């Protein structure tokens with residue numbers, strides 16, 4: 061997270077830290093006791109799924125304080141429409157091997173109904189993005205969980221306000237822009253998969269996933285996030301299904 | 315009209331006709347008699363921050 065601040069311990073309780081062989085891989089969002097939403101691109105280079113661990117209640121990576129809960133990942137579900145190495149349909153649903161225990165430091169973010177998210181949440185201007193990613197473009201990652209308030213843009217406005225790039229990937233209906241174009245605040249690579257959370261009448265909901273950008277906090281550009289509202293039905297159906305052998309599962313989308 | 319001001323609902327909203335609507339709440343919450351408000355029914359409902367609550 062570039063230009064944000066430390067999320068006071070326990071104030072970003074749905075934040076998940078994904079690790080591969082003990083190394084930081086990506087962020088994620090706990091949506092119930094056994095399900096985590098992350099970004100599909102986070103799994104492009106996995107060779108052995110058994111090395112993947114999800115950690116909840118994490119705050120400071122330098123010390124263990126007893127609130128951390130680690131779980132093996134039993135399943136990683138990705139839309140059939142996602143193509144590794146590309147930007148569209150950047151979402152993954154992870155099933156933990158054992159449920160986490162809800163505590164003051166481990167609480168799920170609400171996955172909203174599609175109508176509520178499209179008719180109402182999509183119009184809440186600011187939302188919080190968080191993670192242990194790079195504090196600066198091409199800089200070191202954070203030791204403490206960081207959080208940042210970012211305003212959402214309608215796609216037409218994002219394109220108009222952004223500077224044109226040749227190889228620049230298209231902003232589809234499965235994405236949305238959020239952030240600032242003055243080069244001061246944005247999420248970054250190491251925050252990939254983390255939550256873009258929206259407040260509405262005293263409750264927080266999952267509206268986006270840190271996905272991509274043309275550099276972090278690049279002047280003239282905005283952060284791009286997976287538009288979670290497009291996947292509500294897809295996620296709900298999967299959560300009602302029985303686990304299947306083999307960690308990675310490509311599921312039909314829609 | 316769920317599209318306007320969330321139909322007055324604190325959380326979820328469903329339109330039935332041009333004059334009827336039902337509000338609903340996420341699991342871990344129950345709808346109050348006002349027909350719009352949601353109150354937690356568990357210790358750790360989704361989307362709430364315990365230390366701040």
Ligand SMILES: CCOc1cc(OCC)c(F)c([C@@H](Nc2ccc(C(=N)N)c(O)c2)C(=O)NS(=O)(=O)c2cccc(N)c2)c1
Pocket residue numbers: 101102104105145146147148150229246247248249250251252270271272273274275276277282283284
């Ligand atoms: C679907 C993911 O696609 C990308 C594309 C990127 O540049 C395109 C020109 C990019 F920098 C990131 C980047 N995520 C990201 C996250 C947020 C930002 C930001 N500025 N907010 C931002 O600027 C970048 C990323 O994860 N890069 S990666 O090398 O680790 C990687 C791993 C696996 C698959 C992919 N595609 C990338 C990911």
Ligand SMILES: [Ca+2]
Pocket residue numbers: 118119120121122123124125128
């Ligand atoms: Ca710790």
Ligand SMILES: [Ca+2]
Pocket residue numbers: 159160161
């Ligand atoms: Ca348990």
